[PDB]
Amino acid sequence: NGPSRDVKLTFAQIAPPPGSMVLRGINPNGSIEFGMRSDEVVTKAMLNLEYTPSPSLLPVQSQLKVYLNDELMGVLPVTKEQLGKKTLAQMPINPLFISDFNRVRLEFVGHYQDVCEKPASTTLWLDVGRSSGLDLTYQTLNVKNDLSHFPVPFFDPSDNRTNTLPMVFAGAPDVGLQQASAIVASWFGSRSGWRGQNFPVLYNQLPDRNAIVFATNDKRPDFLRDHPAVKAPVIEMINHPQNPYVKLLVVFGRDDKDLLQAAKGIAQGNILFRGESVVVNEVKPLLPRKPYDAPNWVRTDRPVTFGELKTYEEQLQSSGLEPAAINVSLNLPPDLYLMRSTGIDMDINYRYTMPPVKDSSRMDISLNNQFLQSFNLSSKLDGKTDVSIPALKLGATNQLRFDFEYMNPMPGGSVDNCITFQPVQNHVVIGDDSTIDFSKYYHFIPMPDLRAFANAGFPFSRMADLSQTITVMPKAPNEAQMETLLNTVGFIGAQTGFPAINLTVTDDGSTIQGKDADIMIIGGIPDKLKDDKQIDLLVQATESWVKTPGAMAAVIGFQSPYNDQRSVIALLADSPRGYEMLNDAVNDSGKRATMFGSVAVIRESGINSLRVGDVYYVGHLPWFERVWYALANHPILLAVLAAISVILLAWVLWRLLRIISRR
């Protein structure tokens, strides 16, 4: 037996509630995409359809095929009495061909006239209902308990849903255990990517999921008893003592240092986990990380050529009668200075198939579903394309999708004589020689803002490995403080492409005096003031603490009075219920992006965002070129400065004239 999940997914083709997709004679293919977890087995597959055929098609000579993976298992011909009203459709699918990946697509073949039919006509059309999709039930399988498939039993990069793995601790962690948990949590985030993370911690209890257990040979979580003492950090894959269906991950050691060493090995040496009970003895770094070298972010040392931006094999080309929209996902750091009116040029060298005659076909480059510019598609077949695309996103993932719109050439040809021909298809490819320029750009941005932090985590992800980062926690943190820390570092790890293994966590504010690093505030300050006046009072309340040493959830960020070059970030609450709603506010991207300014108070109903305090700037741009931007805004003042220089020239000329006369 075992637990089973009954998932329900609709057609992969876009179908907004305003209007569902229609299978016409020009595009009769509708594909459904799903993936397996490499651990579940399909027990019962069911497919439901609600189709309404037009009454202008022959019943017998019109059918639709159902494909699971390049094969058919049944057809559903339309009867004479079915052409008018809607009817349900039940089609079982044999669960034998579902190994790891399937493309369930349906094709429509129909006929409306015998002696002469016109392809891609309007009189024939098919549409499906809203509730039309596969109904397959998964089933948990007994894994062979092998550690070589890391991290497949914990996180398989094949699901479209967010993961949720708890991290049970030994109870009341200390200064030497929090940092190791952050390192492991961050490495999951660097692998989670856009799927999202959720890390609910526990204490002295074991859940019914694939959790992770931490032990230091002392104060074991009341189920690791009778285990002999270990002389080395041992990582096992023991199962749940009550049911052998979930897989845990215990980490052993002798003290705080031992567990930290084991955690670093997991996040770095993931390619040599063999068998079971893998031990690590010596893992040390050799070289630091160059600034702004996150794998997800595009590098600026030399212009890239879409070589590492493919992240797929058959993405830069399309085929078939209707070519698909080729898209490229790119992320850029938010440090690119604005107010330059320059843009980013392109060097696209796409090649296509020669059309027969001048069909006036056009190709348009779209950006975030917005029309930008269209070109011609005739070469009497390779065309150089240079364009500076404005209006980027600067922090969020912005796509550069563009499609190839082709009209049917010679639809009927002759009207008096019936002509029938097979539909001809064509291919298209963009090429890997197209480059974009990021050679010499300067880093400059107003620092006291949370939009950059909420989109890319700039105030903390300056270094890929987080060489300088200071986090403070109250003594003996409860579930809330650990829960909000693990998600936050995972958010930083998710945006970047390298786990944070060099960060540190302290327990008091005495060690941060004079330190040149990234100060981060997590926990709770005295919260007693009324709801009316948190806009201004909280500004000095947190500042007074940094210098020396129906719930509320406020995130703030201001200048750190230690270096005048780094930003502090503070997360405050009053009740554990506040932490839970604060985490839910940042986990989802639906409303988290709607957060700008310094102070962002989280309320039960809505989010009130405002900007207060004195702003400042970050980065190191040439001071000589700074005046160029300042003089740009002041047009009248620039003329006055030139006039003053010209007026002073006359005084020098008068003195020169007197000197010339005396000469």
Protein model, in words:
The PDB classes it as transferase. The entry lists the keywords synthase, biosynthetic protein. Bacterial cellulose synthase BcsB with polyalanine BcsA model. The protein: Cyclic di-GMP-binding protein. Organism: Escherichia coli (strain K12). Gene: bcsB, yhjN, b3532, JW3500. The chain is an alpha+beta fold and about 675 residues long. The chain folds into 5 domains: about 20-135, Jelly Rolls, CATH 2.60.120.260; about 165-280, Chitobiase/beta-hexosaminidase domain 2-like (Chitobiase, domain 2), CATH 3.30.379; about 305-440, Galactose-binding domain-like (Jelly Rolls), CATH 2.60.120.260; about 445-620, no CATH class; about 625-660. It contains 8 helices and 31 strands. A 7-stranded mixed sheet has the order 25-24-26-28-27-29-30, with helices on both faces. A 6-stranded mixed sheet has the order 11-10-12-14-13-15. Strands 2-7-4-5 form a 4-stranded antiparallel sheet, with no helix packed on it. α1 (about 180-190) links the parallel β10 (about 165-170) and β11. α1 packs parallel to α2 (about 255-270). It is globular, with a radius of gyration of 32 Å. The N and C termini lie far apart (about 110 Å). About 25% of the residues are buried.
